[PDB]
Write a protein that binds this ligand. Structure first.
Ligand code: QUE
Ligand code: QUE
Lengths: 807, 807
C-alpha cells in the first residue's frame, strides 16, 4: 500500500492467513461465526509473534556462543505502549499482514485499537527505558531490560464533572500474548531477618522469602534479525488458621500488584522499598548465574554493565557487594572495585522532592545487612573525601550517604555516585546544572565520573509507526536509511524551497488533523474545528511544567476576543492532557480549572469555533501516537532549570510541529540544532531565575503592573469560572499570588507576546510549513540510537553495529 | 504395544511428532538443548489438546443446532485428577503418542508424572462429579459441569515427625494447558445491598459486585467424538487511598482462592456461603441466556435440568425464583412450578454434622432478597403440609425450612426437597435410610419424589487408564466393548476354571505390586516386601470410617506375633492413607497413631518383613490410580449406617482386590452382585447398631470381656507407642472408652476373626484368584455409565446414546 510498510509478498500473505486461521481455531477455540474483533486481534497477535521466535532463540543462543559484555538496564518502569504494530514494522510484515487481514475481510487498524497499552510507567523516565530497549536491539547490543511486571500499570484516568477519577489499569484481563512466563526460572528474594557474624563471614538469617517469577517479552531490532529480551519479575508466595494462611499469600504477592503513580516525587512507603529490593535482588542473581555459566570476578566488569535508571534500583550497589562479600567470599576491596566498575547511574531531575531518602529505621528493619554495608561504604567514601580535601568538614557532612536529623536517612543519590564509575544527566543544560549545584562536591572529587547523555526517542514508534504518511513523503526523496540513521534527515534542508515537498508536508499534517478530529468525535462526541491551529500541551500535570501558564494564556485569548469581538484572530483548538498523581491536590485542581475554562469558553456564542479548550482524557503512549502527529504547536513551557530534558518535545519536532518553549532541558539543544530563529523561545533563562531567587520572587509586583493579568486573577477569585462555587479556585490563586515556586507571573508577558508571533506565522501557511521543514530536517540528533551509541562507547565499553543476523 | 491402547498409525505418529516440535518451538519457545521434561510434558499436552478442538466446537455447535434438553451438573467440587492420559485414551491416541514420544527419545509415562492433579475436591462427592462428567459425555448427553476454579485445591499433605502438615496446592503454578479462559463471557454476581419494593416488583439494590470469569475445560466421551464442557468460575474485582483500593481488589478475588477442606462437615463461614452463591448466580445467568438464545418459560423445564450435588448449590432454588419473579416478571406460582420441575437434589450422608444450616442473620445481610424468597417458600410449603396432615403441628415444626433456637437457621436440605422434583440417595441402603429416618416426613408428603441412584465409577480412568494390564487380559477374551458396557464383565465367570486366565490375573496383580513397591522405594526410600498381602485402607480420615478399628487389628497382629514368634502368619504390608481436615483434632491424632504403630512395628527384629505398617502420604486421585491396582485386600469398615455409598470400594472391586467390609452403603450391593460368599462381610448390621443405641453403648463391657483388646488399650495408655510422651494418645483412649459414636469395640472381635479368614484364603493362591475373578466379573453394575443412564431416564427425562459424531 505505502512503501516504508514493506512487501505484501504472495506466499507471505498466504502463509499469514492460514496461520491466522490456525490460531483462531486451535489457540482461541473459535470459528468465524462467533469470533469477535478481539479474537481476531489475538489470532493476529499470535501469528505475528511466531515470526520472532526463530530470531529470538538464535539471538540469545548467539550471546551464549560469542560471550559479549552484557548490558543490564535496570528500571522500575518500562512504558512500552502497544506491541503489535511495532513488531510488524520491525520485522517488515506490516503490509503483508494488512493485505492478509484485508483478504480475510478484516481492517487491521481496527484490530490494533484492541490492544491494551503495557502502561508500566509514569512518563518520561519510563518511556526512555522503552525507547532505549528498542535502540539497543537495533544497534546490536546484548542488552536486557529488567523490571517488575505490575499487575496494574499507571491508572486509567476518567474525567467526571471535570475532575480526575482513577481506576485500576487492568491490562492483563484478556491475557498478554507478547510475554512468555518462565516459572521454571523462579528465584528467591529475602526480606527482614537479622545479621549473624560467624567466620566465615556475615550471614543474613531468619528472613521471610518472596519468590520472583520472570516473564520474558521479546524486543525486536529494526530489520536486523536481533531479538533481545525484556524480563519482568512477578511476585509469588513461597511453597511453604489454614484458610487465612492461604489468603495471606496475597501480602507477599502485593509486591508486584501496582505501579506507584508518582511522577518526579518521593513517597517513603515500605511497599515501594520492597518493590525496589525485589527487582534488584532477583535481577542480580540472574546476572551472576549467567556470568558463571560461560567464580573469579576480576573479569565481571568486562562482562557486565548494570545501568541504574534513577536511584530506584540503587540497592543494586549494596546488593552486589553483599553477594560478592558474604556469598562469594571476596575481600571487601576487590568487591568494591568490581561494583564501581560494573555500575553507572542516570539522574533525571534536580527537584529536591524527587530525591530518595529512606529512613534508616526502615532499612534497618527490612534490609539489615544492606544498611551495614551502606555504613561501611559511607565510611570508606568519606575517608576518601577527607584525604582529598583535608579539614573540610562541611564538605564531609554534605557528601555523606547519611543525613542527620529528627529522622536519620540514607541519601540514595549519594550512594549511586559513590558506587558508580559514571553518573550522567539527560541533556546538556541539566548535566551542567548538576555539576554547578547539587552534585558539585562530587564533581570536585571525581570529575571524570560526570557525563552528559542527551535523551532521544525512537524514530520507529515515534515516526514510522505513528506517522506513516510523513515517513512516506520523506522516504520518497531520501530512501529508507534515515529510519535507523536519523541524521540523514538533514538532507531535507535541500527541499526547503521545493514546492512539491512544501505541499506534501502541509497535506500530511492536514490528514493527521482530520483523522484526530474524527477520533475525538467518534470516541467522545466532541466537535473540533479542523482549520484551527492545534495547540497542544501533553505531559504529566505538575507545577514545574506550568500548565497554569497555558491556562493564563488561554483565558487571555478569550478576554481579548470579548473586548474586541470583530478583530480577526487565528482560530485555535487548545488541547491539554495528562495525569495527576492521586495525592497531589494542586495537580488535580489544575485539571479542574482547564475543564472549567472549557465550560465557559466552549459555550460562548461570540467565540464560537474561533477558540476551543479541551482536556484530553487518559493521556498514555497510544494516545500520544495519535495526537502528536496532528499537532501544530508544541507547548514546552517549563520554568528554566526544572525540566531535565523532556522527550515529548522531541516527538513533536519529529512529527511536524513547531515548538513554543523556554530555554530548558533539551529545548536548548533542539533550538541549537534547528537555529533559534526556527523556534518560539521565550521567558527567563536559568540565570534570570537565579537573579529573581536572589532578590525574592514577589508575584504581587506582576499583578500590579499587568492589567490583563489582574483581570484573569479577579475572574478566578470572584467565581467567573465556577459560578456555583465562587471560591472553588482560591487555592490556585493563593499559590500564584504567594507561594509560586515556578514563577508563573514572571514569564506571562513574554509568553503572551511570543504566542502572538506564533499566530502571525500561522497566517502565512507557506512560511509556517518551511519553518516546519527546517525543524524536521534537524531532529536527527534526538534519535535514541544516537543516545544509546553514546552510552555504549562512553559508559558501557561496547561497540554498536548495524549488521543483520541470519534470516 | 498393547491393543486396548489403540493404533500407532505411521501418519498419525509422524504428525504428532512434528506438532510436538512445533509447540516446543513456537508455544514454549525452547529448543531441544535447554528443554526440561516439564517442557516436553507441555509440548505433548498442547499437541494432544489440538486433537479435541475439532470435536469440541462441533459438539457445542451441534447442541445449538438440535436444541436438546441441557443437563447442568452443579457442584462445589470437581475432583478431576490428571487429564493427559485420560484424553489420549478417550481419543484413541495413547499408543500413537507413546510411539511418537519414543521416536523422539522420550518416555511418555515419565512425562505424565509431571502433570498436577486438578484436586478441586475433597473425596467421594467431588470424584463422583468427575466420573459423572466422563459418563455423560460417553452417553452422548448435552451436559455441562459448573463449578469454581479454586486457585488452590485440596491441600498437599506432608508428614513431619509422623504428623500431618498442610501446604498450599499451587496447581496452576506452571499453567493449565487444558482450560481455555473466556474473559469475554464474564458476568456480574451481587452481594449485600437491601431490598426495595416498587411496582413493578421487588428490587435488589446497593449491592457490591463481584465478576465471575469462566474457564472452559474439555470433557471427551469414550471414542464417540463427543466433547462436552466443564465450566469453572473465577472471581474478579469490578472494573470500578489509591494504592490500598487497588490492593483491596484481593478481598473480592478471595472468593475463588481456596477449596474448603472439610469432607462431610459443615462450617458456617461467610466466605463459604459466598462461594456457594457465586457459583449459583453465575451459572444460572449462563443457563438462562443459553435458553433464550434458541422469554416464555413454560418450556424451561423441558430444556433445562439442574442437578444439585448436595446442598452446596441449594441457593439455585431461590436464585431461579428471584430471576423469574423479579427480573422476568413471572407470577410466583408459575415461577415455582418451573423451579421445582427444573431442579433435583442428591444427598450424600445422613450424619447431622454435615447438614448445612445457615444463620438467618448471615443470609439476611449477605442475601436479603434470597432470605425473603426462602420465607415465602417455607410458608407455601408448610401450607401444603397442613392441608395434607391437618392438625399435625409437630410435623410442621420438624419440616420447616426454618429452625428455631438461640440462633434461627435455614435448613438447606429442607429447602432442596421443597424446591426439587426428585431427591435421591447414592446407594440402596442409604436411600431407604433417608425414607425411614431424616426425610421420613418429606417421604410421607411426596413419596414419588424419592429415588435411589447407586453410585458408580468410570471404567475408563478406573480400569483402562490405571490398570492397562488387567484391561488387556480381559480384552483378549471378550473384546473391548466392556469398556463402555461394563455389564459384559459377567462373561468372565465362564473363565473361573480357565487355567490361563487364573494365571494371567495373578500375574497382572503381581506386576502392579512390583511396580507400586518400586514407586515407594524410588520416591520415598521405604522398603516393602512384595510377597506380602497388600492390605489397604485409603479414604479421608474420619471416625465413621474407622481407621482406628484397622489400627486395633494391626496391633493385634503384632502382639500375636510377639506372643508366638514361631507360628507362621501370612505376611502383610498394611497401608493406610488419607487427609484429615486441618481443624479436626481427632483425625490428626489418628494419623499420628498410625505412624507411631509403624515406628514400633517396622523396627522390631522379631517381626522383620512379616508385618509392615505404612502411612501413604498425600492420598489424591493420581495416587489412587497407583495403589488401588496393587491391592490385595480392600478395607471398607465403616459403622453400619454411616457410609452413604462409598466409591473407593468399587475401584478396588474393579481392579482385583477382595473386600473386607460391613454391610454399609454400596458394599451391600457389591456383595449381592458377586454373592456374599465372595466377600469378607463382618460386624453389626444397621439393625444391630440401632439395638445397641436403644440399650446404650458401653465400651467398658467389651474391654472387660476381651483380653487382647484390653492389652492394646493398656499399651496405648501407658505409652508403648509413644515412649517419650506416654500420655500422647489419652484423647484417643478416652474417646474409645467413653464417647465412641461409631462403636469401634463392638465390631472388634468379628473383625479380627474375619481377618483370619482373609489370611486363610491368601494361603491358597489359586482359590484367592478364583474369588477375585468372581468379583471382577460382577463389578459391571458399578459403572458410572449405568448410574448416569438412570439419572437421565428417571430424573432428567433424556435418552442416552452410544452413536459417534462425524470424525
Ligand atoms: O484518530 C485515530 C483513530 O480514530 C484510530 C481508530 C480508532 C478506533 C478504531 O476502531 C479505528 O478503526 C481507528 O486510529 C488512529 C491511529 C493513528 O495513528 C492516528 C489517529 O489519529 C487515529
Ligand atoms: O509405581 C508407579 C511409578 O513409580 C510411576 C512413575 C513415577 C515417576 C516416574 O518418573 C515414572 O517414570 C513412573 O508410575 C506409575 C503408574 C501407575 O499407573 C502405577 C504405578 O504403580 C506407578
Amino acid at each position: 500500500q505505502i512503501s516504508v510498510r514493506g512487501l505484501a509478498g504472495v506466499e507471505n500473505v498466504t502463509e499469514l492467513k492460514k496461520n491466522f486461521n490456525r490460531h483462531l481455531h486451535f489457540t482461541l477455540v473459535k470459528d468465524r461465526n462467533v469470533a469477535t474483533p478481539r479474537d481476531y486481534y489475538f489470532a493476529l497477535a499470535h501469528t505475528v509473534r511466531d515470526h520472532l521466535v526463530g530470531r529470538w532463540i538464535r539471538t540469545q543462543q548467539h550471546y551464549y556462543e560469542k560471550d559479549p559484555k552484557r548490558i543490564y538496564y535496570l528500571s522500575l518502569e518500562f512504558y512500552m505502549g502497544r506491541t503489535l504494530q511495532n513488531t510488524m514494522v520491525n520485522l517488515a510484515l506490516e503490509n503483508a499482514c494488512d493485505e492478509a487481514t484485508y483478504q480475510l475481510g478484516l481492517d487491521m487498524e481496527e484490530l490494533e485499537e484492541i490492544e491494551e497499552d503495557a502502561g508500566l510507567g509514569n512518563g518520561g523516565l519510563g518511556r526512555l527505558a522503552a525507547c532505549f530497549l528498542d535502540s539497543m536491539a537495533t544497534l546490536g547490543l546484548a542488552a536486557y531490560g529488567y523490571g517488575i511486571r505490575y499487575e496494574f500499570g499507571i491508572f486509567n484516568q476518567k474525567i467526571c464533572g471535570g475532575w480526575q477519577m482513577e481506576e485500576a489499569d487492568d491490562w492483563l484481563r484478556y491475557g498478554n500474548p507478547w510475554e512468555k512466563a518462565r516459572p521454571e526460572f523462579t528465584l528467591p528474594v529475602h526480606f527482614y531477618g537479622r545479621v549473624e557474624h560467624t567466620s566465615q563471614g556475615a550471614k543474613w538469617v531468619d528472613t521471610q522469602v518472596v519468590l520472583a517469577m520472570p516473564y520474558d517479552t521479546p524486543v525486536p531490532g529494526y530489520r536486523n534479525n536481533v531479538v533481545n529480551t525484556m524480563r519482568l519479575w512477578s511476585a509469588k508466595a513461597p511453597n511453604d488458621g489454614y484458610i487465612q494462611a492461604v489468603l495471606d499469600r496475597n501480602l507477599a504477592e502485593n509486591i508486584s500488584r501496582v505501579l506507584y503513580p508518582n511522577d518526579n516525587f518521593f513517597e517513603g512507603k515500605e511497599l515501594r522499598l520492597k518493590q525496589e529490593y525485589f527487582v534488584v535482588a532477583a535481577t542480580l542473581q540472574d546476572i551472576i548465574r549467567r556470568f558463571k555459566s560461560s567464580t573469579n570476578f576480576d573479569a565481571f566488569p568486562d562482562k557486565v554493565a548494570i545501568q541504574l535508571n534513577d536511584t530506584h534500583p540503587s540497592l543494586a550497589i549494596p546488593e552486589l557487594m553483599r553477594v560478592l562479600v558474604d556469598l562469594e567470599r571476596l575481600d571487601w576491596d576487590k568487591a568494591w572495585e568490581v561494583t564501581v566498575k560494573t555500575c553507572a547511574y542516570t539522574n533525571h531531575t534536580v527537584l529536591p522532592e524527587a530525591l530518595e531518602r529512606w529512613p534508616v529505621h526502615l532499612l534497618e528493619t527490612l534490609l539489615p545487612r544492606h544498611l551495614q554495608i551502606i555504613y561501611e561504604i559511607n565510611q570508606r567514601f568519606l575517608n576518601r573525601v577527607a584525604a582529598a580535601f583535608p579539614g573540610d568538614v562541611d564538605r564531609l557532612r554534605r557528601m555523606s550517604l547519611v543525613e542527620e536529623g529528627a529522622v536519620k536517612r540514607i541519601n540514595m543519590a549519594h550512594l549511586c555516585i559513590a558506587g558508580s564509575h559514571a553518573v550522567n544527566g539527560v541533556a546538556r543544560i541539566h548535566s551542567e546544572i548538576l555539576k554547578k549545584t547539587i552534585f558539585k562536591d562530587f564533581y570536585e572529587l571525581e570529575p571524570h565520573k560526570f557525563q552528559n547523555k542527551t535523551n532521544g526517542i525512537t524514530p520507529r514508534r515515534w515516526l514510522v509507526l505513528c506517522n506513516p504518511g510523513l515517513a512516506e513523503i520523506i522516504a520518497e526523496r531520501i530512501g529508507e536509511e534515515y529510519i535507523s540513521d536519523l541524521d540523514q534527515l538533514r538532507k531535507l534542508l535541500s527541499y526547503v524551497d521545493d514546492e512539491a515537498f512544501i505541499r506534501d508536508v502541509a497535506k500530511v499534517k492536514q490528514e493527521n488533523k482530520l483523522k484526530f478530529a474524527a477520533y475525538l468525535e467518534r470516541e467522545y462526541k466532541v466537535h473540533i474545528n479542523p482549520n484551527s491551529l492545534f495547540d497542544v500541551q501533553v505531559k504529566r500535570i505538575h507545577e514545574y511544567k506550568r500548565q497554569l501558564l497555558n491556562c493564563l494564556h488561554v483565558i487571555t485569548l478569550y478576554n481579548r476576543i470579548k473586548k474586541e469581538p470583530n478583530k480577526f484572530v487565528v482560530p485555535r483548538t487548545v488541547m491539554i492532557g495528562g495525569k495527576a498523581a492521586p495525592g497531589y491536590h494542586m495537580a488535580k485542581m489544575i485539571i479542574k480549572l482547564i475543564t472549567a475554562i472549557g465550560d465557559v469558553v466552549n459555550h460562548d456564542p461570540v467565540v464560537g469555533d474561533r477558540l476551543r479548550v479541551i482536556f484530553l482524557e487518559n493521556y498514555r503512549v497510544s494516545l500520544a501516537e495519535k495526537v502528536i502527529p496532528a499537532a501544530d504547536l508544541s507547548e514546552q513551557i517549563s520554568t528554566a532549570g526544572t525540566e531535565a530534558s523532556g522527550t515529548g518535545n522531541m516527538k513533536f519536532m519529529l512529527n511536524g510541529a513547531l515548538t513554543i518553549g523556554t530555554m530548558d532541558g533539551a529545548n536548548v539543544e533542539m533550538a541549537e540544532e534547528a537555529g533559534e530563529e526556527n523556534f518560539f523561545i521565550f521567558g527567563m533563562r536559568v540565570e534570570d531565575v537565579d537573579r529573581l531567587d536572589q532578590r525574592g520572587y514577589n508575584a504581587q509586583e506582576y499583578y500590579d503592573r499587568i492589567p490583563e493579568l489582574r483581570q484573569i486573577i479577579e475572574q478566578l477569585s470572584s467565581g467567573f469560572f465556577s459560578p456555583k462555587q465562587p471560591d472553588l479556585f482560591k487555592d490556585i490563586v493563593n499559590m500564584l499570588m504567594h507561594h509560586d515556586r515556578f514563577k508563573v507571573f514572571a514569564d506571562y508577558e513574554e509568553y503572551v507576546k511570543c504566542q502572538e508571533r506564533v499566530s502571525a506565522l500561522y497566517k502565512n501557511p507557506r512560511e509556517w510549513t518551511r519553518m516546519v521543514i527546517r525543524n524536521i530536517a534537524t531532529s536527527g540528533k534526538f534519535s535514541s540510537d544516537r543516545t544509546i551509541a553514546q552510552y555504549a562507547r562512553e559508559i558501557w565499553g561496547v561497540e554498536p553495529s548495524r549488521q543483520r543476523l541470519p534470516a
